[PDB]
């Protein structure tokens, strides 16, 4: 009889989500968790926090998972702060809450579904190895996450049995005044056929404009960007070179209601297993004001047990940093027209391309041998 809440934002198929939640069966776990579907707009984060507190104080609610159609990380940060303050378990299905923060709180209980910084680098290295690439470059902005990802990629490539050729590393800062000439002069020193870029959208657009002004971006250039460089596949800045390769989250094939129902069922099963094993259920005063004395009942057992859960023949165990062990990723490619096309999908460190020969964009002759 654990209180589970579900909040939605914007337009969404509430009937399908309700049917998926009602179709869930947890007779073996004997959790008997209730469902509470509540709709909310995008007014402000304070209103969302007030609604979350009201839902928690409504009828012994011990958990809530919300989804938003926006993309601002401020909502996810406020949700993580509220979860750390109230010491309650909260999860993010998709949307703005699906963003992976860099530094999580120590005394917090939060879990999200998505890939990590090292997972994207590993996927990029696997794609480069599959594409017969043996040379690359390192270029990033002054962001700390990009520098950390570059350092992790360098540490992973250092302890590699196969060969590797690193030309140089670029750490130019675009925030300086009148520093475009120095950046353009330093960009000409690049000679490798592949270059990696990890920055924001505006920084990526500026780098692409500088590369187009230099002229080494038409034929003998290969640019690789992370999932945070694109953000929205529907919108294109019309300044990126054709043929760019970047990774992204599997959202076109994964269904939001089915994933939400699976996550709710996994959370209910984990809560039932914890209540059966530890024989302790945390049910404190779910209030908003005067929450300093609410930390008398420690909830570290629920957070430690939530990193190990499985249901319906699937693995949903998280990590110590708050990231999924086996995430779902896809490969995107740039065609002649501005659009994003699915090239391949990777899962459990296993690549699966939809073409044996990679499309190159008269040369490229075919030679037969016996």
């Amino acid at each position: 009889s654990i209180g589970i809440a579900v909040i939605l934002v914007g337009t969404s198929d509430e009937v399908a989500i309700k049917d998926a939640h009602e179709k869930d069966d947890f007779h073996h776990l004997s959790v008997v968790p209730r469902v509470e579907l509540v709709a909310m707009n995008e007014t402000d984060p304070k209103s969302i926090i007030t609604r979350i507190c009201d839902l928690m104080s409504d009828r012994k609610i011990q958990g809530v998972v919300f989804a938003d159609d926006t993309d601002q990380e401020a909502i996810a940060q406020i949700l993580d702060f509220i979860s750390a303050q109230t010491l309650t378990p909260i999860l993010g299905i998709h949307g703005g809450s699906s963003m992976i923060m860099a530094d999580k709180d120590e005394s917090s209980m939060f879990f999200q579904f998505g890939p990590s910084i090292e997972q994207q680098a590993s996927v990029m290295l696997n794609i480069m190895e599959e594409y017969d690439w043996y040379i690359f470059s390192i270029v990033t902005t002054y962001f700390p996450g990009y520098q950390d990802f570059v350092n992790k990629i360098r540490s992973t490539i250092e302890n590699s049995f196969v060969g590797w050729e690193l030309e140089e590393v670029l750490l130019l800062d675009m925030s300086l005044d009148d520093g475009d000439s120095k950046i353009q002069n330093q960009l000409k020193k690049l000679q490798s056929p592949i270059i990696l870029l990890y920055c924001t959208k505006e920084e990526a657009t500026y780098i692409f404009e500088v590369a187009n002004s230099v002229g080494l971006t038409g034929y003998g250039y290969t640019w690789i960007v992370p999932s945070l460089v694109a953000g929205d596949t529907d919108t294109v800045p019309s300044e990126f070179p054709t043929g760019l390769i970047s990774v992204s989250y599997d959202e076109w094939d994964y269904g939001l209601p089915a994933r939400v129902r699976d996550g709710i069922a996994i959370i209910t099963t984990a809560a039932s297993d914890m209540l059966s094993e530890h024989s302790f259920i945390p049910e404190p005063k779910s209030s908003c004001y005067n929450t300093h004395e609410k930390r008398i009942y420690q909830s570290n057992m629920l957070n430690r047990y939530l990193i190990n859960v499985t249901f319906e023949g699937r693995n949903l165990s998280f990590s110590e940093d708050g990231y999924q062990m086996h995430p779902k990723l896809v490969i995107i490619l740039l065609n002649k027209e501005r659009k994003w096309e699915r090239v391949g999908k990777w899962k459990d460190k296993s690549l699966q391309m939809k073409y044996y020969v990679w499309p190159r964009m008269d040369d490229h002759l075919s030679i037969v041998t016996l």
Partner: protein, 370 residues
């Protein structure tokens, strides 16, 4: 037009003093005063901050340390509340090294020296003392990890590797293993950076193993000197202490002057939009948040009441003053002051550990080899 400011602090006498200072500085564009107290919870404090921002529609919020000994949770709430609207926030007594990465805190300004400068101060002291072999002992924590990274960077800048690094768990009851492992080296410069609780146990374990006699040098910080660590502290230990760290009214005037200069330099720009008073109504990001923060970061102060005021890259107040204290006959007394460039000693004498008047070499020669 008229633009008001916001603040949240305790000690209403200091609030009235700051209001009088603001009213006096207004005579040098109309500014108002709006401040409130602190609540006993994080959600209540966030709600009060949102109400104050909706009532005043200010563009900046000043946060100080509360009467609690930690004074770390109060700064996270105001920062998370201001991050939703991309409103800049300036801190007065913020010294925690966890609030350093720009990912967690998007817009946050400090007015004191963080714990990261302690590593640079220790490196400068070791260079002035002609030392080349030191042992860094830091506990597993965010501030400890940041200090260890800063020390490693300062060592690699001079192309000198560390002798031996030992890490301990926060709250370990038994630490004799780390002491026994560190006592099997050839270096004598032991650097300690941890909390005041574990500092007493570390000093007890060092005195029990006879590791505080002649030929040993102990370099600690402000956290290891204050608290209950002075009861079991050993003689000859050299620590650090902030010049104006305890005082909070001296930096308030400099912060108010910097805020006034930023408001004067930002009101003369095009496409400027004031902060919306709809805290609960709208959740949009103010476009005047990043520009104002960038203008305030480069707003170098000519002169103030606490010396030169500047801003580092990741929101840090450089050009700080430190007092080199010395524990002699259970009495702390300054012996020098490091004014950024170098430390000039006074006419007083210093007593090293063990009663040796002469300066110790801080190194040994191993005679047994394997």
């Amino acid at each position: 037009k008229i633009v008001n400011i916001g603040a949240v602090l305790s000690t209403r006498k200091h609030e009235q003093m700051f209001r009088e200072a603001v009213n006096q500085a207004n005579k040098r564009i109309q500014l108002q005063a709006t401040s409130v107290t602190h609540k006993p919870n994080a959600i209540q404090m966030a709600l009060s901050v949102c109400e104050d921002l909706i009532s005043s529609q200010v563009y900046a919020i000043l946060v100080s340390h509360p009467p609690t000994p930690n004074d770390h949770f109060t700064p996270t709430p105001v920062s998370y509340t201001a991050g939703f609207y991309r409103i800049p926030v300036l801190g007065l007594t913020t010294r925690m090294s966890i609030y350093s990465d720009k990912s967690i805190h998007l817009s946050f300004l400090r007015t004191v020296p963080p714990y990261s400068h302690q590593s640079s101060v220790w490196f400068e002291m070791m260079r002035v003392y002609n030392w080349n072999h030191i042992i860094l002992l830091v506990s597993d924590d965010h501030e400890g990890r940041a200090a260890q990274k800063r020390l490693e960077t300062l060592l690699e800048e001079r192309e000198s590797k560390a002798e031996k690094v030992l890490q301990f768990d926060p709250g370990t009851k038994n630490v004799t293993a780390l002491l026994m492992e560190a006592r099997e080296l050839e270096a004598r410069v032991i650097i300690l950076s941890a909390s005041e609780d574990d500092a007493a146990t570390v000093y007890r374990a060092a005195a029990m193993l006879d590791m505080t006699g002649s030929g040993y040098v102990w370099l600690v910080g402000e956290r290891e000197i204050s608290g209950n660590a002075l009861r079991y502290a050993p003689d000859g230990i050299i620590g650090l202490q902030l010049i104006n760290g305890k005082n909070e009214s001296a930096h308030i005037s400099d912060a108010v002057g910097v805020v006034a200069q930023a408001v004067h330099e930002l009101l003369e720009k095009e496409n400027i939009t004031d902060p919306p008073r709809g805290c609960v109504g709208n959740t949009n990001i103010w476009k005047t948040g990043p520009l104002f923060k960038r203008v305030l970061m480069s707003s170098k102060y000519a002169d103030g009441v606490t010396g030169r005021v500047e801003f580092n890259e990741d929101g840090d107040r450089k050009f700080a003053q430190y007092s080199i204290m010395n524990l002699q006959n259970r009495k702390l007394v300054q012996v020098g002051i490091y004014n950024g460039t170098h430390v000039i000693p006074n006419d007083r004498k210093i007593i090293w550990p063990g009663g040796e008047t002469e300066k110790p070499r801080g190194y040994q020669m191993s005679t047994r080899l394997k």
